């Protein structure tokens, strides 16, 4: 009875992270990935868009970009937790920090792993995906 | 930075100012500069270089084109040295001196599947006082319910040897420049006839 669509289209957009609080830029990108902005049409299908994050290096963070943000990874070996790259340090490779935030807000199933494909993070001002002319999102909601 | 390739000829005895000093002899034969790789073109700085000569009936057409691009009679072996940016070709003579420390890398003589007593120095069990596992065997492998498993990285019987091995800070006893020989104090990893790469000391030891 209820309408379900094609898969026909892919739409690209650049989000500028420059000076935005991370975490809020997080949920914005995570929803534009999930497909919640067009009608969700169907959960089965990733109708969501491709997103290009530029100036990922300059993301703002409150309270402590130090001290607070202790990112953590476990290695499989005894003593392999002590790997707490934390902090400002990961802004030595910024494209992962943003990329971690969005990935915690996509669902963990088989679609989410596939949705990871749709996030394209470039720490510098510029991006090379000029070919799929993306055009822009921006600041905040209503 | 500085490096060259060679074959491990053997190990003999030699006196220097009246003190016996075991030496490994290495043939550091001439090394053609085949491919030359810059960061500007290949994204990092290094130089490719070749060793044992190989008759051209034995050569792939693609490999013939690779050697022909530079103008080099084809060599059985090729390697790269980061940071080493020479000019011409790479003889033993010019780039080493008597008494440099130099790192010596080679491929360990390989010893097959070995038990924990050989591979990892385990104690092994008493050979008496009634006890099968009369030696050779690893003991316990875990704790019990609340570790639950055996550890990753654990130590147990395996393929010992046949590994890459560097030996730091070997001393250069003698260079017989014209014959392309080089004597080097102590024992390089490998086997006679094997490939070895001689290189600067990786550590700038004060």
């Amino acid at each position: 009875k209820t309408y379900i669509p094609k898969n026909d289209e892919q739409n690209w957009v650049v989000v500028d992270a420059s000076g935005v609080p991370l975490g809020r830029l997080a949920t914005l990108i995570a929803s534009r990935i999930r497909g919640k902005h067009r009608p969700d049409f169907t959960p089965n299908m990733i109708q969501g868009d491709f997103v290009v994050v530029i100036n990922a290096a300059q993301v703002a963070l409150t309270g402590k970009k130090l001290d607070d943000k202790v990112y953590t990874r476990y290695t499989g070996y005894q003593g392999g937790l002590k790997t707490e790259t934390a902090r400002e340090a990961l802004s030595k490779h910024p494209e992962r920090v943003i990329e971690h935030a969005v990935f915690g807000m996509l669902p963990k199933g088989r679609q989410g792993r596939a949705m990871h494909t749709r996030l394209k993070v470039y720490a510098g001002e510029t991006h090379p995906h000029s070919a799929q002319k993306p055009q822009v999102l921006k600041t905040q909601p209503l | 930075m500085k490096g060259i390739l060679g074959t491990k000829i053997g190990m003999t005895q030699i006196w220097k100012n009246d003190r016996a000093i075991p030496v490994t002899v290495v043939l550091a034969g001439p090394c053609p500069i085949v491919q030359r790789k810059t960061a500007q073109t290949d994204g990092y700085e290094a130089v490719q270089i070749g060793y044992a000569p190989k008759a051209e009936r034995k050569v792939n057409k693609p490999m013939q084109g690779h050697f022909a691009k530079a103008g080099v009679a084809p060599t059985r072996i090729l390697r790269e040295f980061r940071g080493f940016a020479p000019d011409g070709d790479s003889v033993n003579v010019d780039i080493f001196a008597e008494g440099e420390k130099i790192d010596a890398t080679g491929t360990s003589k390989g010893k097959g599947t070995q038990g924990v007593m050989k591979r990892w120095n385990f104690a092994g069990g008493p050979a008496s006082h009634g006890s099968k596992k009369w030696h050779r065997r690893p003991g316990s492998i875990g704790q019990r319910k609340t570790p639950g498993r055996v550890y990753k990285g654990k130590r147990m019987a395996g393929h010992m040897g046949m590994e890459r091995v560097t030996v730091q800070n070997l001393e250069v006893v003698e260079i017989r420049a014209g014959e392309n020989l080089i004597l080097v104090k102590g024992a390089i990893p490998g086997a006679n006839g094997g490939l070895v790469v001689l290189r600067s000391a990786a550590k700038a030891s004060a």
């Binding site: 309408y3 902005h37 969700d40 | -």
Partner: protein
Amino acid sequence: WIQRINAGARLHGMNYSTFINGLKRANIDLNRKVLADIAAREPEAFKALVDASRNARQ
């Protein structure tokens, strides 16, 4: 149903909450069952329903 309806609603600048309110506050407007499909196929119509809800909330 719901998850499509506010996606269209916000496409027109109001969320689900301040929409299905404003149809019910528009009282006799009551079509309710699967407004989803109206939002998903005719946007010329869902825009008019957005204008109706917003007029009712003023």
